[PDB]
Amino acid sequence: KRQWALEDFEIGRPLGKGKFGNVYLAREKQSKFILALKVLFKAQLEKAGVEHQLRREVEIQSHLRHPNILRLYGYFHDATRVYLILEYAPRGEVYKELQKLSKFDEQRTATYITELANALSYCHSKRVIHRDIKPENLLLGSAGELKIADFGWSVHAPSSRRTTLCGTLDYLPPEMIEGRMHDEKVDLWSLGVLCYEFLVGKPPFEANTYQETYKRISRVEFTFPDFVTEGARDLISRLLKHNPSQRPMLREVLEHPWITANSSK
Ligand SMILES: O=C(O)c1ccc(Nc2ncc3c(n2)-c2ccc(Cl)cc2C(c2c(F)cccc2F)=NC3)cc1
Numbered sequence: 001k002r003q004w005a006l007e008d009f010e011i012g013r014p015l016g017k018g019k020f021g022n023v024y025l026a027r028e029k030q031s032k033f034i035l036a037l038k039v040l041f042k043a044q045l046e047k048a049g050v051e052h053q054l055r056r057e058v059e060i061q062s063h064l065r066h067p068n069i070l071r072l073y074g075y076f077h078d079a080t081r082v083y084l085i086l087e088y089a090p091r092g093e094v095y096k097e098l099q100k101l102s103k104f105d106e107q108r109t110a111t112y113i114t115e116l117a118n119a120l121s122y123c124h125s126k127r128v129i130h131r132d133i134k135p136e137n138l139l140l141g142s143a144g145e146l147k148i149a150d151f152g153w154s155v156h157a158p159s160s161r162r163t164t165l166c167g168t169l170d171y172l173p174p175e176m177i178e179g180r181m182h183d184e185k186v187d188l189w190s191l192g193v194l195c196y197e198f199l200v201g202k203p204p205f206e207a208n209t210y211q212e213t214y215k216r217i218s219r220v221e222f223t224f225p226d227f228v229t230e231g232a233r234d235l236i237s238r239l240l241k242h243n244p245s246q247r248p249m250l251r252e253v254l255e256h257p258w259i260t261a262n263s264s265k
Contacts, residue, residue, distance in 0.1 A: 192239025
């Protein structure tokens with residue numbers, strides 16, 4: 001019922017630069033509740049033509065609540081900018097963790113996969129598919145649990161990381177690159193690419209050129225390093241099926257023996 005304004009927030013340190021503004025660590029003045037305030041410059045939004053996309057995602061995002069989806073508490077604007085009031089993830093970016101460690105062990109990875117499969121299953125129930133779950137779009141909450149970030153198009157790919165185009169291609173299902181129709185099964189594919197990247201430290205299809213990466217995805221050709229265990233190979237292999245129809249249901253990922261044995265939750 002209450003209406004938010006810039007004055008309601010104590011703006012602390014800048015967390016990073018988006019394409020249309022900055023994101024800041026902030027506190028709501030009364031409750032001192034910590035949150036992330038994302039700023040967007042309207043004229044810039046309009047010129048990039050993302051103005052209506054932003055509105056659609058805000059409407060959709062506003063109805064989503066899940067422990068592993070970064071929460072949109074609300075938003076407001078003045079004549080020049082729009083302000084997104086976002087959940088703050090106190091443990092920062094997964095992608096950085098991934099380079100600090102190079103790759104994640106089976107317990108960490110399987111627990112992450114559980115968290116995401118729950119999130120994606122919830123999304124599907126809300127008719128929301130093809131959520132971006134590549135590492136650069138994953139944050140960490142106060143309990144080390146994954147948080148799927150919102151509005152990934154408004155931020156630049158990490159410099160230290162894969163660039164935007166490469167990053168996105170790395171995670172595209174064969175059906176979407178072969179220009180066919182797609183459905184929820186797209187999320188099973190992303191989960192499989194992620195699981196692989198978490199365990200190995202690089203996505204399964206990445207090659208020197210976009211062209212080769214494209215080719216490899218289309219043919220679903222990749223190899224497991226020797227250190228990937230049989231249970232992980234089984235799950236990843238079931239996820240990275242060319243025919244979307246042969247991919248597991250999310251409940252089947254959640255009950256998969258490698259997940260059950262390795263997950264903390
Ligand atoms: O460095 C630290 O010490 C650090 C860094 C980050 C956090 N936590 C955090 N929590 C929420 C958000 C962000 N960061 C965040 C920060 C900056 C920017 Cl440019 C974008 C966002 C995002 C975001 C987004 F909008 C689209 C895609 C990906 C996103 F990550 N969403 C809110 C804590 C500590």
